[model samples]
Target: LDGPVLAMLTTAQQQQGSGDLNSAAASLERAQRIAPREPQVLYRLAQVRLAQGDAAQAEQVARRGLSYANGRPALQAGLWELIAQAREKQGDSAGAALARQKAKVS
Candidate 1:
């Protein structure tokens, strides 16, 4: 399971870097089916959704990731930055500001 998950994660990263977010999302979805509550998968899914201009879904998934982030400042900061991006894109200035402040905590 770990091997398959890592392969899919790596493949998704390469696909995203190549500007194929849809493909990247497909890979993440497959990985998600295997580990539905994984924070890393949720983070990547949020990123692809954000890049696709789907801020609502991005924020939704990012918050899910945040719940599993525990107290790791770096991981929490990364998710918060994405949350800020999603909130900002949707004209939630106050939300974006708060998210930005959260990101800065790390």
Candidate 2:
């Protein structure tokens, strides 16, 4: 949690606190570039994207996080929960239920 990646994440948090979701997304994207396979970065990105009303992208980002989330059941559960939320927002009730079930199994 040191150096540029941490700074970018902190900046994104500040932007989110200020209600600038766009900038928060951009900052998290930069963090991803620096640590593409880092689950934390992807998780935060997915959350901000969801908050920005981009449910599709948020689901995509959460899926990407899953690829990197192997071996971490807590993160896996959290990611699935995020996916469920995104699916619900997109009116995919079945998909949302499936995602929520996945979280429970994790």
Candidate 3:
């Protein structure tokens, strides 16, 4: 990653760690714009979106990260977890459970 991308990621992480999900998401979005194909940025963005209760957007971002980083343990775990959360929010217990199981496996 480039310097600005790394800085954005670091800032996003710090914001997320501090419970500032919106700021984290915004920083991650900036990182994504800087490096759209970066799985790390997408995954972090998904995490923030999930925390923000934007489940559909989280799922979309997680899926996009998965598309780029299939088989990556961390990314897989994040994608599945976000998907599960989104499904749960949508009242799909079965889907949520299945996704949660997958997340555990990853």
Q: Which candidate is the best by TM-score?
A: 2
Please report the TM-score between candidate 3 and the true structure. 0.83
**Backbone clashes in each candidate structure, one number apiece?**
0, 0, 0
Per-residue alpha-carbon lDDT of candidate 2 for residues 24-102, written as tens digits (9 for 90 to 100): 9999989988898999899999999999899999999999999999999999999999999999999999999999999
Inter-residue clash pairs, candidate 3: none
Worst 10 residues of 2 by lDDT: 1-10
lDDT, ranked from best to worst: 2, 1, 3
lDDT of 1 by residue, 1-106 (tens): 5898888899999999999999999999999988887888889999999999999999999999999988778888999999999999999989998998989976
lDDT scores for all predictions?
Answer: 0.92, 0.94, 0.85
Q: Give candidate 2's whole-model lDDT.
A: 0.94
- For each candidate, give its TM-score against the true structure: 0.92, 0.94, 0.83
TM-score of candidate 1 relative to the true fold:
0.92
Model 2 Cα displacement at 3 (Å)? 2.5
After the best TM-score superposition of candidate 3, give how far the Cα of residue 39 lies from its true spot, in angstroms.
1.5
lDDT of 3 by residue, 3-102 (tens): 9999999999999999899889889888877798988888888888888888888888888887888768877887788888888887789999999898
What are the runs in model 3 whose C-alpha is more than 4 Å off?
104-106
Put the candidates in TM-score order, highest first: 2, 1, 3
Model 1: residue 103 alpha-carbon error in angstroms = 1.9
